[PDB]
Amino acid sequence: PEKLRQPPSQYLKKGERTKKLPPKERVIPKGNEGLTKPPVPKATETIK
Amino acid sequence: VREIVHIQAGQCGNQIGAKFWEVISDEHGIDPTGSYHGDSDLQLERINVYYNEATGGKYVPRAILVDLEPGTMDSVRAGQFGQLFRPDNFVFGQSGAGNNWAKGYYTEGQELCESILDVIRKEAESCDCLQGFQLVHSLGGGTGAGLGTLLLNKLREEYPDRILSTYSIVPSPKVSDTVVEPYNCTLSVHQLVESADEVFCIDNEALYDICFRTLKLTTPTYGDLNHLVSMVMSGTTCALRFPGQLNSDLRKLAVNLVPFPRLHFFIVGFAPLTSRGSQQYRALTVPELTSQLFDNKNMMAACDPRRGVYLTASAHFRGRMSSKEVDEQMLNIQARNTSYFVEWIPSNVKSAICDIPPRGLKMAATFIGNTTAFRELFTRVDSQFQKMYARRAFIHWYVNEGLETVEFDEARSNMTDLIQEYEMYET
Amino acid sequence: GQMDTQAYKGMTPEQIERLKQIQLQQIEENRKRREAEAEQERIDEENRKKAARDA
Amino acid sequence: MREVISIHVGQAGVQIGNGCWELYCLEHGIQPDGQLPDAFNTFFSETGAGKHVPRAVFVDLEPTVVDEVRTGTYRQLFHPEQLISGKEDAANNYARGHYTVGKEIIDLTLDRIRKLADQCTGLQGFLIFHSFGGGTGAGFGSLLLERLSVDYGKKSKLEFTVYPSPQVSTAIVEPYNSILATHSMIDHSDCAFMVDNEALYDLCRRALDIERPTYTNLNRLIGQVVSSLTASLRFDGALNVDFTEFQTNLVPYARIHFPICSYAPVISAEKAYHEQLSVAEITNSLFEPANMMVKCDPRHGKYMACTLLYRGDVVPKDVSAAVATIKTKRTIQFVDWCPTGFKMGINYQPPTVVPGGDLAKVQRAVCMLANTTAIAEAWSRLDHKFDLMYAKRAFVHWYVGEGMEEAEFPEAREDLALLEKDYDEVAAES
Amino acid sequence: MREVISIHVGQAGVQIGNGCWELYCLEHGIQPDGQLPDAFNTFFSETGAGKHVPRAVFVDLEPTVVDEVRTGTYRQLFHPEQLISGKEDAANNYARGHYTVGKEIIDLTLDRIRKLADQCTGLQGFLIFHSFGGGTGAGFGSLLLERLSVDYGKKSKLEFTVYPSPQVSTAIVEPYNSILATHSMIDHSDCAFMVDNEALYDLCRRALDIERPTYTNLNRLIGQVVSSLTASLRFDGALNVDFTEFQTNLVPYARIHFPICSYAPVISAEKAYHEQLSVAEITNSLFEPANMMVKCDPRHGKYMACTLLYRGDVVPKDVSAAVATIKTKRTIQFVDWCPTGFKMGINYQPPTVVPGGDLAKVQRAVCMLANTTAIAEAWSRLDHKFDLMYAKRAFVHWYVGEGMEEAEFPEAREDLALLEKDYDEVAAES
Numbered sequence A: 001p002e003k004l005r006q007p008p009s010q011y012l013k014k015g016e017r018t019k020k021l022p023p024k025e026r027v028i029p030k031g032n033e034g035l036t037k038p039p040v041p042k043a044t045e046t047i048k
Numbered sequence B: 001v002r003e004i005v006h007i008q009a010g011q012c013g014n015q016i017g018a019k020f021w022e023v024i025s026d027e028h029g030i031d032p033t034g035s036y037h038g039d040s041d042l043q044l045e046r047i048n049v050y051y052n053e054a055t056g057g058k059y060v061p062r063a064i065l066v067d068l069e070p071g072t073m074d075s076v077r078a079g080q081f082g083q084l085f086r087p088d089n090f091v092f093g094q095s096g097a098g099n100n101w102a103k104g105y106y107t108e109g110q111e112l113c114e115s116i117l118d119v120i121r122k123e124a125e126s127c128d129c130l131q132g133f134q135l136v137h138s139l140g141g142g143t144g145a146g147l148g149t150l151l152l153n154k155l156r157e158e159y160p161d162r163i164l165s166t167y168s169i170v171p172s173p174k175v176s177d178t179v180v181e182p183y184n185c186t187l188s189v190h191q192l193v194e195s196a197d198e199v200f201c202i203d204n205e206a207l208y209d210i211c212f213r214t215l216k217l218t219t220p221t222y223g224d225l226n227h228l229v230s231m232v233m234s235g236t237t238c239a240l241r242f243p244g245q246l247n248s249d250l251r252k253l254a255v256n257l258v259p260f261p262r263l264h265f266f267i268v269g270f271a272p273l274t275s276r277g278s279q280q281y282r283a284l285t286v287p288e289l290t291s292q293l294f295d296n297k298n299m300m301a302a303c304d305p306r307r308g309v310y311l312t313a314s315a316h317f318r319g320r321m322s323s324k325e326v327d328e329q330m331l332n333i334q335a336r337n338t339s340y341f342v343e344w345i346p347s348n349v350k351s352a353i354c355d356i357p358p359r360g361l362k363m364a365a366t367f368i369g370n371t372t373a374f375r376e377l378f379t380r381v382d383s384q385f386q387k388m389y390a391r392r393a394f395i396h397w398y399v400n401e402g403l404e405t406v407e408f409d410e411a412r413s414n415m416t417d418l419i420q421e422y423e424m425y426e427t
Numbered sequence C: 001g002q003m004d005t006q007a008y009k010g011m012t013p014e015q016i017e018r019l020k021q022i023q024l025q026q027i028e029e030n031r032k033r034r035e036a037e038a039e040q041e042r043i044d045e046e047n048r049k050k051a052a053r054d055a
Numbered sequence D, E: 001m002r003e004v005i006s007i008h009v010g011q012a013g014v015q016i017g018n019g020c021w022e023l024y025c026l027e028h029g030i031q032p033d034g035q036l037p038d039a040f041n042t043f044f045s046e047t048g049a050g051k052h053v054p055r056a057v058f059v060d061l062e063p064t065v066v067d068e069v070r071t072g073t074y075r076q077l078f079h080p081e082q083l084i085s086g087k088e089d090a091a092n093n094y095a096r097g098h099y100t101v102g103k104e105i106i107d108l109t110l111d112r113i114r115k116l117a118d119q120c121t122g123l124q125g126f127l128i129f130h131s132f133g134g135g136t137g138a139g140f141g142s143l144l145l146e147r148l149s150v151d152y153g154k155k156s157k158l159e160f161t162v163y164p165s166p167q168v169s170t171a172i173v174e175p176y177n178s179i180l181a182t183h184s185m186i187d188h189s190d191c192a193f194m195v196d197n198e199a200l201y202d203l204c205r206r207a208l209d210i211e212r213p214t215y216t217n218l219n220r221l222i223g224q225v226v227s228s229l230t231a232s233l234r235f236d237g238a239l240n241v242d243f244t245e246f247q248t249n250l251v252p253y254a255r256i257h258f259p260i261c262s263y264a265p266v267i268s269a270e271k272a273y274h275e276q277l278s279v280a281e282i283t284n285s286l287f288e289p290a291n292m293m294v295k296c297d298p299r300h301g302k303y304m305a306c307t308l309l310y311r312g313d314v315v316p317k318d319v320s321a322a323v324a325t326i327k328t329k330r331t332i333q334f335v336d337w338c339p340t341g342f343k344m345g346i347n348y349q350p351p352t353v354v355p356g357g358d359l360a361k362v363q364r365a366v367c368m369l370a371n372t373t374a375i376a377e378a379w380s381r382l383d384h385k386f387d388l389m390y391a392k393r394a395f396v397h398w399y400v401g402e403g404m405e406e407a408e409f410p411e412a413r414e415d416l417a418l419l420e421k422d423y424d425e426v427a428a429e430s
């Protein structure tokens, strides 16, 4: 029982339990190499 | 197997909870002696959500009743369904309530908190699984507002994962039953914001307005007003107890409706509420329920949604019905009144369907919504608080119990920021 | 090959079967109309009388 | 003999599944107990005795949907092991169904699917069902596919998924789940079919004459398509088409696999009695935008190779005249580099109708799958909805707390953006 | 002709033997009193007239467990000289059951077993049962084996012992007793099989559908393996394996003898309705980590040579196809040396069922014994548990007070390290 008791001096201050999500600065996304399936060949790159 | 533990605090909590078990007992079909005498096999599928079985065919609810004085408890047991509860779950003190928050939180709360937690420990760890707790209390009082929040902190510390759904009654704007409510509500909100997952706000005046306008009850009593609340708490958990075409339990509701950790206060409403003579005119269709739920008068909280803007909305439908008809209405109501919805969240309306409706009612609906209109209700309690606080009013009663004056300033500041937080997301 | 020729005596079973399933569907929706009207209206008739007369 | 294995994920997958197997047992002539009052080997196994067992696995993270089958009439047909149920669902959260709760049950299911593949001597592919908006459908569906890709390699993993509708929506977080799952399906799936509820919602009201449908009617319409697709492997036909032939003919490149669906005739019993519904008639109805199972009009885009499946009376003579006519139609476009553009299949067994059935017994019917650039319309709508939510960080906290690193949100943005660039580049002509 | 002697020590051994001799009596057709209403004589002696007596010796230092048999139904079957009981148990103390109290009964016991060996003209092995954690199973069992090593020499001695579970434990001093008996077992035993209660508990709940098993259910499972193991000497078969053939094939070295065991099919009646359970399926079920009766993962390490035993209408071809399929499993690791890796046996007598039983009446079954390096995982548990206790000298006073010298504690620790070295050296790359 001694551990449960909460004195008045330990009143719940704001932000103790509501954590905030950090603002997400980011790395450049690894776009086209993220997939093992090769990209389509383009229209202008046709063999003559 | 998603068991839920039920906790009742104070005069408001015990009377609401006692009527709540009358509703469930008839839905599942439990005789007041505690034995099953029902009519369908579907009732026994998932009675484990709320009940335990004593060997002998007697079912016992997972209910714990908490009070500082035993006056209201003995009034409950003398009721018809009072024999149902386990005698050892009645946990009470032997001192006056005081209608005081600090006295309930610090003086009498610490003594009873030791016994209440272990009674919770008995029911919480006796089942195969536990989804979350269920608290019923009022904010204007001293026991439910003060002792209820104390248990809420301990429940969070021991059981962080579980969903701490609470149902609260908010003090009324015109006449409210306690002088010191602005102090009690302001302190209670501080604990509710940081600890609880979901909070529902009920105002007594709306219940009076609903009964007088819609049901045409010439003399509504507190049994009938508490009957309306029992429908909503029954509606939310009905997805757990019965099969449906689209299941939506408590955790689905919290994820969809809550966009940010602190904005989770909710308003509720129930349809169909049929006037005793208007029934001969009302052909009960799916669009008919849609008209009632989004109608501003049906709302159980005295905050007008039209004065604010909606963030999220959810509707539950009970009964065998077309899935197309429900989905079309959700699109129809959203596009018709776009002025009350936020642009940067499309598809603001969540929907669900359940198979088995309440007895007699061939279909029924439940609504839960979140809006910036809650700024109306907080500005009221803040304005009353400041003028009562600017001069040292009744404060000396709380300080004599031991509460430091810095707690109020911390409490009001957190309340003030949540008002601003609703303001900024309206843009 | 283009030998749905059985239709010389095969589509007649089909169309006669089409007729019997047509009647079955209309029986099913007809009885559903009768089931709905009694349930929804006349159980409500008791709710009206009891609530009003007890009041 | 030759086998196909079915996996059903989520509420949509499961309750689609019971409708499909209700259709198949009635089609083959098997009682719900599995006994009899052929092509059984494709979908069923002989346990000994006169009893058969489906080649299916039902997976969900909550027991309500699975327990309906467990107490239902069909409970005796299924093996108790095939019905796998979790403890608590993903709450429509992709991260919860992928990282925290999904990994608690992934290895249990992977044993059971592999164990079923032992009995399938001539296995040639899988069928996998999803609902994109669901947490388990999207979250666990990604984890299942990634593991299944390395477990079996070069085996055709065919998918059939419910794309979120352009306007009808039941989940607020729905755009979040769909885009994250887009990366997983594009690399690992061999081919995945798209359908949306809203098109089925309109089709079942207009063509079929139903005033107010439920999920039950739509799941039966899906079952007809799967029956038509698999009928070539099961029963005799003038032109057989295996799973591999579909894969080669439909998709020009790896990243452009996604087809769309269509079916004809869809007609009420009292209206089907009125007309004869020849081969040319049913072929003409397939190409009207009204009949698409995905609510995107092909006329904004162009057609690549299309596959036609005929189940009924039809035999090649009138097929050639019909496709020749459809080529003359100037309301239908084709990309210049696909002059042939067609693959035709013909089977003799007519469709099977159901007690309480929504449809009549038409003596001939046709099923259609086409690859078109009109599907890019659906991706643009999903892309815009996601950016509105993510600009103000409307729901990031729920996904981050359940194990996801937020850097995966922009990565899922680029993979969809890259896919949109591929379809429009392919749509060009020289 | 050929005879086997079964010895039961402690509570665990005699309680298992109660179920075993139940199973033997029903299988051969002998009433519990020893009369009739072949291979009888490999386990029983024909006393004359028409009565039979088992070849077994029951010993425990306390009379409660034995007196249950003396008052039980089987009291008429046994010869009272065989039932040996002490006065007070070893109190789970190794020193007590080996030096102080074990000496009281050791020479009385050795006369009875030797007297039983005179009637066995063609004896070929012994069957000895232990529980490592118990004082009598370890303290007295170690003493018994040491004498039997010099008495009989190189007659093969096989053991069936219950190893302490990874997490389930009923005695605090359990780690202390196991290590001390490990020194005695490794030198004297010809080959000792491993079982543990924790894996049998999980097996008895999943495969056999039992909510809450007892020691009774687990004891019948072990009897089936021994019945399958000894069935080669009893009944006809296409491929016979003697005890010596088991001995040479399974062990490549002297200190690497410890195998693990498996059995298939273990199925309930209402599940076998859905499964044919042919040779291919039962062979596959053996190698899953779930079916191992010691809770160690074979995927964790490598396999050495395995031995397979079949009981039923099994054709030698289907055996070869099953073994060929197993070698294709890349999840199964074999050592480069021993590419052969297998010995197969076929016998015609199907398994026997028991009234009040838990198993199904399957027409064929397979028993699996394998040598693997994964058991080093189990020894790592016992080593770590011992070090924490001995670091602070948690229970040394009890053992020293009963005559035990402290110097034995590090020496027994020394051997287990050497045994742990031996397995990894062999498990290392060629």
Ligand SMILES: Nc1nc2c(ncn2[C@@H]2O[C@H](COP(=O)(O)OP(=O)(O)OP(=O)(O)O)[C@@H](O)[C@H]2O)c(=O)[nH]1
Binding pocket: B245, B246, D009, D010, D011, D012, D013, D015, D016, D060, D061, D089, D090, D091, D092, D093, D131, D133, D134, D135, D136, D137, D138, D162, D170, D171, D197, D215, D216, D218, D219
């Ligand atoms: N066509 C069709 N669509 C369905 C059906 N049932 C559900 N859906 C769609 O599925 C989506 C809902 O997600 P769920 O079915 O619950 O998928 P889930 O992965 O199980 O989601 P969780 O319950 O959180 O695990 C909605 O968008 C529905 O439109 C059905 O019976 N037929």
Ligand SMILES: Nc1nc2c(ncn2[C@@H]2O[C@H](COP(=O)(O)OP(=O)(O)OP(=O)(O)O)[C@@H](O)[C@H]2O)c(=O)[nH]1
Binding pocket: E009, E010, E011, E012, E015, E016, E060, E061, E089, E090, E091, E092, E093, E131, E132, E133, E134, E135, E136, E137, E138, E162, E170, E171, E197, E215, E216, E218, E219
């Ligand atoms: N499988 C199985 N294990 C048993 C049974 N009875 C006892 N055991 C095991 O025996 C282990 C301990 O050995 P003891 O029961 O003390 O037997 P003991 O060797 O005679 O030891 P003492 O009684 O002190 O002389 C426990 O861990 C049990 O798991 C049984 O009936 N079946």
Ligand SMILES: Nc1nc2c(ncn2[C@@H]2O[C@H](COP(=O)(O)OP(=O)(O)O)[C@@H](O)[C@H]2O)c(=O)[nH]1
Binding pocket: B009, B010, B011, B012, B013, B015, B016, B097, B099, B138, B140, B141, B142, B143, B144, B145, B169, B176, B177, B178, B204, B222, B225, B226
């Ligand atoms: N809906 C409802 N409200 C009640 C009931 N009884 C009391 N209240 C309200 O609860 C508020 C505070 O009640 P209070 O006596 O302080 O409850 P306490 O928490 O036990 O102290 C008052 O404003 C009452 O209007 C009831 O039976 N039903």
Ligand SMILES: [Mg+2]
Binding pocket: D010, D011, D060, D061, D062, D089, D090, D134, D136, D137
């Ligand atoms: Mg699910």
Ligand SMILES: [Mg+2]
Binding pocket: E010, E011, E060, E061, E062, E089, E090, E134, E135, E136, E137
């Ligand atoms: Mg003993």
